[PDB]
Design a protein around this ligand. Structure first.
Ligand code: HEM
Length: 154
């Protein structure tokens, strides 16, 4: 697939607002993912034991992780589709080391779209959400193809 420059603009315009607070958005998104799909918390051996949202809010490990996730995603979106190199190492560790199914990447994409919609309503109207969903679908499709080459397709 291929996004038009206007769609990338909508994606990078709302991403520039997320970057004013990467750690807060990281927390919100991971907590949204774990409350919606609790089985995903099991993949994180570091803080798998957290039982409540309050615990999750108070975990420094969860917040650091959230910042790592968003910083790597932001670096991929800024490429505007030319992300082959950034995707390689990512696809390898999530397919071989962590074992994250494509389904989980769909779940976090939905958590990203839910948080942006709540926090940024004025910059996340319907066209901007369609462009963000396209950009995340592109990311999932290229990662899924890399998973296949690596022998995981999951
Ligand atoms: C937008 C999608 C994602 C991006 C950009 C992303 C990126 C990263 C990055 C950069 C790291 C550190 C380096 C590495 O291990 O590769 C990481 C580690 C990890 N990611 Fe992901 N991730 C994403 C989705 C997920 C999902 C959905 C899960 C789990 C349901 C997951 C589980 C993990 C785990 C278990 C680690 C190790 C955490 C720790 O112990 O350090 N990731 N991820």
């Amino acid at each position: 697939m291929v996004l038009s420059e206007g769609e990338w603009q909508l994606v990078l315009h709302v991403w520039a607002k997320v970057e004013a607070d990467v750690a807060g958005h990281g927390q919100d998104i991971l907590i949204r993912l774990f409350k919606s799909h609790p089985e995903t918390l099991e993949k994180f051996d570091r803080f798998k034991h957290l039982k409540t949202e309050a615990e999750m809010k108070a975990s420094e490990d969860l917040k650091k992780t959230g910042v790592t996730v968003l910083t790597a995603l932001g670096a991929i979106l800024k490429k505007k589709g030319h992300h082959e190199a950034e995707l390689k190492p990512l696809a390898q560790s999530h397919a071989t080391k962590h074992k994250i199914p494509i389904k989980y990447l769909e779940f976090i994409s939905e958590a990203i779209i839910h948080v942006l919609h709540s926090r940024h309503p004025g910059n996340f109207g319907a066209d901007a959400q369609g462009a963000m969903n396209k950009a995340l679908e592109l990311f999932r499709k290229d990662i899924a193809a890399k998973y296949k080459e690596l022998g995981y397709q999951g």
